Amino acid sequence: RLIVDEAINEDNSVVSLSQPKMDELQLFRGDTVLLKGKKRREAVCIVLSDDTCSDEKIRMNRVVRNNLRVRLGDVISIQPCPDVKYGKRIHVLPIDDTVEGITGNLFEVYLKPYFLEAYRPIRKGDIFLVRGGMRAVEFKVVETDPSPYCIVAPDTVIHCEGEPIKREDEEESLNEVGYDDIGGCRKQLAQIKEMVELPLRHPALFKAIGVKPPRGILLYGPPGTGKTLIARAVANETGAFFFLINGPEIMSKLAGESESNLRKAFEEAEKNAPAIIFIDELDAIAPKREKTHGEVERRIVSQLLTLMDGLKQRAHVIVMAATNRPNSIDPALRRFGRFDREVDIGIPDATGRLEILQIHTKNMKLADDVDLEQVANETHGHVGADLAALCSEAALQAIRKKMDLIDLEDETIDAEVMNSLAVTMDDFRWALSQSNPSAPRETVVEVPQVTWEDIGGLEDVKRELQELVQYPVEHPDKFLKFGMTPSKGVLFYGPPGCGKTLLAKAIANECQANFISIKGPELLTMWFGESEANVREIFDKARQAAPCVLFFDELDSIDRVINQILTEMDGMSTKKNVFIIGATNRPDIIDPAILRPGRLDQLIYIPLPDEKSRVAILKANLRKSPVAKDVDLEFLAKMTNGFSGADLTEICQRACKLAIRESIESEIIRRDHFEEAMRFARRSVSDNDIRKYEMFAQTLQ
Amino acid sequence: DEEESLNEVGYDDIGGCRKQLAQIKEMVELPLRHPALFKAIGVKPPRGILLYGPPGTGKTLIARAVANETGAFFFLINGPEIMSKLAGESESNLRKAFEEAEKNAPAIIFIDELDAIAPKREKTHGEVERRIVSQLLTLMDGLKQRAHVIVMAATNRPNSIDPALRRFGRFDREVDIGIPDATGRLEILQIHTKNMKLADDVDLEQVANETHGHVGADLAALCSEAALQAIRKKMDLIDLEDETIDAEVMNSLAVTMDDFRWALSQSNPSAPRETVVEVPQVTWEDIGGLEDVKRELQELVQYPVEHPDKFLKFGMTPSKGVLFYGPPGCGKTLLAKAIANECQAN
Ligand SMILES: Nc1ncnc2c1ncn2[C@@H]1O[C@H](COP(=O)(O)OP(=O)(O)O)[C@@H](O)[C@H]1O
Ligand SMILES: Nc1ncnc2c1ncn2[C@@H]1O[C@H](COP(=O)(O)OP(=O)(O)O)[C@@H](O)[C@H]1O
């Protein structure tokens, strides 16, 4: 009686649970349980343990729900290992269309790396796959004769007789995309699953409910974000039929039968309830422009938005919506009932780029020379499709220097050569050496990681900042119980380049919320273009990125864009626990009419860092570039009167560059470079404006 | 009836793209020259390529050369004769122009002048250009990961190319044919003039120099009306026009330098004046002085591009923007030539 969730570990034969489930039916750490399935299907799976598992919510990969032909959330009774014996005389016959003209019987190439000596058990006639060698192949069990569950021994017969047999079609392959395949976006994909599975997993419960149906969700944002595979993956989860209704073949046909194309595209599967439809790139099919100087696109999108209402409170049609940018979509299309609610997939982050690079490389059989961490760092501002392209032609470069230089080209493939082949680090460098930044440089949402000064500011800036940015997220009602709302916004002002931008990143890292980094000039360049709809769009996608904080700087550089900021900030989503923080250096050229309470009005001064704070930011700086063992951190700050964080980064950048400069200059360490770092000529410090900053400080007093 | 064979062409007939020719060969030879190897490839294929740039750069010859190199079937789907039809059968023309070579795997298709057929503008009134770009977008995706057909796309300037046509997956990584330089112009005139038998008094190298910023089609026109200036002085003055065409007396005639100057009297600026990308020919010893700035720039252009493991020894991004401020005209632009030429940078 355990309920299926999704686990982190890729491997089969893994039960990951919390300890009451293993003490409740005398299970141990090293053991095997039987998996009860529908139509008396059985699967074998070895117990492990973990900590991040909801204890009643058992969590695995796709292989056990492909074995039992079950879905996410079913009930499974548990039978331990001593039902069956050791077993021998095994032989594997795989699927024919998994391979494609492949060399040999492949069990000597694949089944011997399958033996990780953990003795993974095998049910008779079950389904399991081993990845590796540039392409995944599933291994059906056909010609084994043990006792009908077989724990695999190294003494058992690696037998290479059988041909790969024809696929039997009650089961759908794991080459079709799954949830763990789309794992790089370990984020709000989980909650959109959590708000779409209910008519899917509970069809009759939604048949007998009077809930006005959630009948459509938008996945806008950057292209190449797997949205087609998002729909395919949720269809492969819940078993609903998927039909991809793409825009250009709809608009390609002549007038009249394009409507009939929409008719078959709607009710080819309304009788196949539940089912999923998908009308991706809605900018190409549904804009609201006079650029579309015609009427066939209007006749397409009209009655599309009203015969998506073919669910007459007894059907189970559901639509995923995908497009580039939501502002170009028609708003009467976006009107409620016709279309209700919105979410963004957005761009992946570098931390998510780590596991998208991990889970894309399950087949290519990487070597041990690479580390995969430094690969994901420089590719900030790239879509995961571009990373898939990157590792794709990395594999193509790796198979390009081999297999024809050796002149192994023939009509038959050589599986052993490409299985012995592996991708390596300079292959990834060569992949980086092509035109990968075609995914452009837009705004980015990211989970922060800087934590050197995550608890607030310097002195009582800490004690106001930490309460302002994480005491609402556990104590909302305590503020109303003692009288009034939390604050709306706080002001950052003082000397520039002191790490205040990184300080807001550490603030967002402390409260475990997202970070918004909008800067001055990219809003200033579209101030001429008059695209403030994009500005409130990025504000709203920050607002639906709850929890988060919105950090903006150089607000004095704009006064119209600031005026639409003051218009949009009236609907303050404090119950969403998002926050607005504003930064500047010159506080007087901006108007004083934005300083009233209930708005951006709290005016704590951000000081220039002290000598002990200079030692602290030096300690933050030396984590990226290591320091000499002979370092006196007060000696580096003994001549600093107003040296900001930018000045110290300017010192360390040029000192490390001079060290790396003279490290190569010998014919073919850094204490002397620290010595010339504090013993150089210039000490260009803007100390004239700290008097003006204190004039403003005691103007506020 | 049969004309001169388009298949029997030299593979070195293009010479003006020998900075990009190597990697376009290196990106196309795997599905083409290795088809039985490529049907076993589980990596997602190269499915798109885009060649923009200046017009008239032999992209037809590029597609013909790579097709005749790999021996695949070649078809050229040209835009005007497929947009000349009425709606409906022009769509069927596009469908049959996609599917005649699906049975001829592996193959190449050439759908040049995409600017004429797939624009990005609000001026696109009507439905016919929408119905042409649509199902082109989806019938390229009709490859079922077993066919080996592949798009070859030629255009001019990819801003006017539609961004949904420029969709990732719909198009892959893209390259530029660029413009040939004068050093490249030397071998393209060397390979073009194998038929005219130029006189030896010229040196054919300084001829390549003053035609900087020109296309090789204009080079072909330059040698063409140079040859006509060479042969205009005979074949009717002395009247060598016999009952046949006296090919021997005109093949005996040679083109020479004043014919090249008279061909230079025509519209050489009909080439589009475009910004040139090229590894320079002015080197480091051509500029002397300001030695502190010299080794500062020298390390700045050598060690970020050739020793990045030293920069990542600490772990540190190298600097990116250096500044030149001082008196104008001293050679700040001139030292850029040397500092790009020494470290083999474009
Ligand atoms: N979060 C993610 N996890 C895994 N793969 C991803 C992710 N985001 C994007 N991809 C990859 O990007 C590609 C998107 O292909 P494409 O059809 O062009 O875009 P979309 O499916 O978004 O319309 C897919 O092949 C998918 O593997
Ligand atoms: N860089 C170059 N090197 C050699 N020949 C060139 C070059 N650029 C242009 N040409 C010549 O110009 C002609 C271009 O003709 P064509 O391919 O029909 O037009 P387009 O290049 O617009 O497709 C070719 O015959 C080719 O010989």
Swiss-Prot record, chain A:
Q: Which residues carry this modification: N6,N6,N6-trimethyllysine?
A: K291
Q: Which GO terms describe its molecular function?
A: ADP binding; ATP binding; ATP hydrolysis activity; BAT3 complex binding; deubiquitinase activator activity; identical protein binding; K48-linked polyubiquitin modification-dependent protein binding; lipid binding
Q: Which residues carry this modification: Phosphothreonine?
A: T412
According to the record, mutating I102F results in:
In IBMPFD1; uncertain significance
Can you summarize the PTM annotation of this record? Phosphorylated by tyrosine kinases in response to T-cell antigen receptor activation. Phosphorylated in mitotic cells. ISGylated.
Changing K500A: what effect? Answer: Impairs catalytic activity of RNF19A toward SOD1 mutant. Does not inhibit interaction with RHBDD1
The UniProt entry's GO CC annotations, sorted and at most eight, read: ATPase complex; azurophil granule lumen; ciliary basal body; cytoplasm; cytoplasmic stress granule; cytosol; Derlin-1 retrotranslocation complex; endoplasmic reticulum
Return the SMART domains for the record: AAA, CDC48_2, CDC48_N
UniProt effect for mutating T292A: Does not affect methylation by VCPKMT
Q: Which UniProt keywords are given for this protein, alphabetically ordered?
A: Acetylation, Amyotrophic lateral sclerosis, ATP-binding, Autophagy, Charcot-Marie-Tooth disease, Cytoplasm, Disease variant, DNA damage, DNA repair, Endoplasmic reticulum, Hydrolase, Isopeptide bond, Lipid-binding, Methylation, Neurodegeneration, Neuropathy, Nucleotide-binding, Nucleus, Phosphoprotein, Transport, Ubl conjugation, Ubl conjugation pathway
Q: Which residues carry this modification: N6-acetyllysine?
A: K478, K481, K629, K692
Q: What results from changing R135H?
A: In IBMPFD1; without frontotemporal dementia; abolishes enhancement of K-291 methylation by ASPSCR1
Similarity section: Belongs to the AAA ATPase family.
Q: What does the record's free text say on domains?
A: The PIM (PUB-interaction motif) motif mediates interaction with the PUB domain of RNF31.
Quote the protein name from its UniProt record.
Answer: Transitional endoplasmic reticulum ATPase
**Origin species:** Homo sapiens (Human)
Please name the taxonomic classification of the source: Eukaryota, Metazoa, Chordata, Craniata, Vertebrata
The record's gene field reads: VCP
Curated annotation (Swiss-Prot), chain B:
Q: What are the GO MF terms of this UniProt record?
A: ADP binding; ATP binding; ATP hydrolysis activity; BAT3 complex binding; deubiquitinase activator activity; identical protein binding; K48-linked polyubiquitin modification-dependent protein binding; lipid binding
Modified positions (Phosphoserine) are S270
Q: What is the effect of changing N195H?
A: In IBMPFD1; uncertain significance
Describe the effect of E122A.
Does not affect methylation by VCPKMT
Q: Which residues carry this modification: N6-acetyllysine?
A: K310, K313
Indicate which residues the UniProt annotation says bind ATP 2. Answer: G329, C330, G331, K332, T333, L334
Q: What is its main location?
A: cytoplasm
As for PTM, the annotation reads: Phosphorylated by tyrosine kinases in response to T-cell antigen receptor activation. Phosphorylated in mitotic cells. ISGylated.
Tell me which GO cellular component terms the UniProt record holds: ATPase complex; azurophil granule lumen; ciliary basal body; cytoplasm; cytoplasmic stress granule; cytosol; Derlin-1 retrotranslocation complex; endoplasmic reticulum
Enumerate the Gene Ontology biological process terms.
Answer: aggresome assembly; ATP metabolic process; autophagosome maturation; autophagy; cellular response to arsenite ion; cellular response to heat; cellular response to misfolded protein; cytoplasm protein quality control
Q: Could you tell me the superkingdom of the organism this chain comes from?
A: Eukaryota
Q: What results from changing A40E?
A: In IBMPFD1; increased ATPase activity; no defect in ubiquitin-dependent protein degradation by the proteasome; impaired autophagic function; defect in maturation of ubiquitin-containing autophagosomes; decreased interaction with CAV1 and UBXN6
Instruction: List N6,N6,N6-trimethyllysine occurrences by residue.
Output: K123
* Keyword terms, alphabetized: Acetylation, Amyotrophic lateral sclerosis, ATP-binding, Autophagy, Charcot-Marie-Tooth disease, Cytoplasm, Disease variant, DNA damage, DNA repair, Endoplasmic reticulum, Hydrolase, Isopeptide bond, Lipid-binding, Methylation, Neurodegeneration, Neuropathy, Nucleotide-binding, Nucleus, Phosphoprotein, Transport, Ubl conjugation, Ubl conjugation pathway
Q: Quick one: effect of changing K332Q? A: Impairs ERAD degradation of HMGCR
- TM regions (residue ranges): none
Per the record, what about its domains? The PIM (PUB-interaction motif) motif mediates interaction with the PUB domain of RNF31.
Q: How does it assemble?
A: Homohexamer. Forms a ring-shaped particle of 12.5 nm diameter, that displays 6-fold radial symmetry. Part of a ternary complex containing STX5A, NSFL1C and VCP. NSFL1C forms a homotrimer that binds to one end of a VCP homohexamer. The complex binds to membranes enriched in phosphatidylethanolamine-containing lipids and promotes Golgi membrane fusion. Binds to a heterodimer of NPLOC4 and UFD1, binding to this heterodimer inhibits Golgi-membrane fusion. Interaction with VCIP135 leads to dissociation of the complex via ATP hydrolysis by VCP.
Protein known as: Transitional endoplasmic reticulum ATPase
Give the originating organism: Homo sapiens
Parent-protein residues present: 193 to 538 of 806
